[PDB]
């Protein structure tokens, strides 16, 4: 099938240059187009230009003319984005999409890159376990969790016994706190009677910091 | 510089029940070429878009056929029937007929559904957070509706201000519920300096507030 994976979120200073790739697979890379659109925190999505791999030209939309630029790697089939002379009305998620020329149309996009520009260091987050909230021979339901607390900036990845736990989990938008931080939790409901039997594992990743940590939460 | 204006800005529906997604350009979509490069995409929460409609009326491969576009020259229709829990998001119309191509701003689409009341939890901080020097108690408020909720924090039954952060998580695309967490954030000190702790629930779904709480160190 047709996969666009970008590149892992970033954090630069003002002034400094970013780089965002696109890897693409499972078509002919030449023969489609590769547009990139941009999308602020909490606001729309905008259309900055597009590279044709064909002939190896680019075209920018009015606000993206001047510290954008477009490059290709043909015989990786891959797809850059660069910004240089990095400001605050940059810090983004970035996505790359093909263009099937045949309707104009973007049809399928990658999963998206974080791009944060600012001049504080990275900082990464603090696991702690939210201990399950009944014992195992109990009936019903348990809740529990992960508090991911104090890290700069977004995203953090949160998954449960890597992936193989995914019904019932709750992960939670991260809130500022005056230390001018990020936390979050994330939760998951099992069957209690599980609690006996089922280890439960959150698996976080901030990559900005190269923060991995996987905490065992039990009773 | 043709503006997309896409309304309303936020479309709650019911399941089951028919949404109506207005685009309007500026200046006709149609090119001289005779086609008219109208599309739709839709972001789901968290996700990365979806396409959706291209030129005005055809859906994309995989797509359901209760999503239908119309219209032509410079209006243009998405329409929903019989709507499901997974087509919440944010619809996109683009346009790609006049350089350079352009998104409207887009529309939530919103589910209405019948209340349904939070099921309720509190978690005590971790030793290992107290041996860092820091105390979060987090109140968890999971699958409820409609999305407004108040949760009070009482610590040895005087009630709370300002010291809490509450986060809420989308609709949920199964059964478009909510879920919120409350967190009250504490210095070790202050929290060693209370036995109870108490957050209470008041909410559409309960016939009376509902409480939880612990006894520092059980
Ligand atoms: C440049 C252009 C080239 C062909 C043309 O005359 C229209 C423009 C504008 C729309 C563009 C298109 C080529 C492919 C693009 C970039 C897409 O894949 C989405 C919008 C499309």
């Known amino acids: 099938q047709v996969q666009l994976v970008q590149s892992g979120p970033e954090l630069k200073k003002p002034g400094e240059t970013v780089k965002i790739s696109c890897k693409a697979s499972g078509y002919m890379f030449t023969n489609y187009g590769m547009n990139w659109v941009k999308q602020a925190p909490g606001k729309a999505l905008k259309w900055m230009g597009w590279?044709?791999?064909?002939?190896?030209?680019?075209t920018f939309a009015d606000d993206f003319k001047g510290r954008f630029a477009f490059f290709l790697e043909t015989s990786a089939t891959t797809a850059y984005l660069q910004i240089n002379n990095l400001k605050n009305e940059d810090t983004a998620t970035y996505f790359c999409?093909?263009?099937?020329?045949?309707?104009?149309?973007?049809?399928?996009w990658g999963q998206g890159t974080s791009v944060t520009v600012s001049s504080a260091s990275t900082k990464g987050p603090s696991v702690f376990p939210l201990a399950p909230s009944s014992k195992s021979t109990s009936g019903g339901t348990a809740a529990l969790g992960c508090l991911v607390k104090d890290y700069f900036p977004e995203p953090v990845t949160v998954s449960w016994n890597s992936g193989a736990l995914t019904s019932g989990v709750h992960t939670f938008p991260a809130v500022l706190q005056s230390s001018g931080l990020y936390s979050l939790s994330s939760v998951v409901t099992v069957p209690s009677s599980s609690l006996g039997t089922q280890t439960y594992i959150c698996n976080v990743n901030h990559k900005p910091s190269n923060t991995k940590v996987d905490k065992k939460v039990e009773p | 510089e043709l503006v997309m204006t896409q309304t309303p800005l936020s479309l709650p529906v019911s399941l089951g029940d028919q949404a109506s997604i207005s685009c309007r350009s500026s200046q006709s979509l149609v090119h001289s070429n005779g086609n008219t490069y109208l599309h739709w995409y839709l972001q789901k929460p968290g996700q990365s878009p979806k396409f959706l409609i291209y030129k005005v009326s055809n859906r994309f491969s995989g797509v359901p056929d209760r999503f239908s576009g119309s219209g032509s020259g410079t209006d243009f229709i998405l329409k929903i029937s019989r709507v499901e829990a997974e087509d919440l998001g944010v619809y996109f119309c683009?346009?790609?007929?006049?350089?350079?191509?352009?998104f409207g701003g887009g529309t939530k689409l919103e589910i209405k559904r019948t209340v349904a009341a939070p099921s309720v939890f509190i978690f005590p901080p971790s030793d290992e957070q107290l041996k860092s020097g820091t105390a979060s108690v987090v109140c968890l408020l999971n699958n409820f509706y409609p999305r407004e909720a108040k949760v009070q924090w009482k610590v040895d039954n005087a009630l709370q201000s300002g010291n809490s952060q509450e986060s809420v998580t989308e609709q949920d695309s199964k059964d478009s519920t909510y879920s919120l967490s409350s967190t009250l954030t504490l210095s070790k000190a202050d929290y060693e300096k209370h036995k109870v702790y108490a957050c209470e629930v008041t909410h559409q779904g309960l016939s009376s507030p509902v409480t939880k709480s612990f006894n520092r160190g059980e």
């Open positions: 683009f346009q790609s007929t006049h350089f350079f191509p352009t």
């Open positions: 590279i044709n791999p064909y002939t190896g030209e680019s």
């Open positions: 999409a093909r263009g099937t020329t045949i309707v104009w149309a973007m049809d399928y």
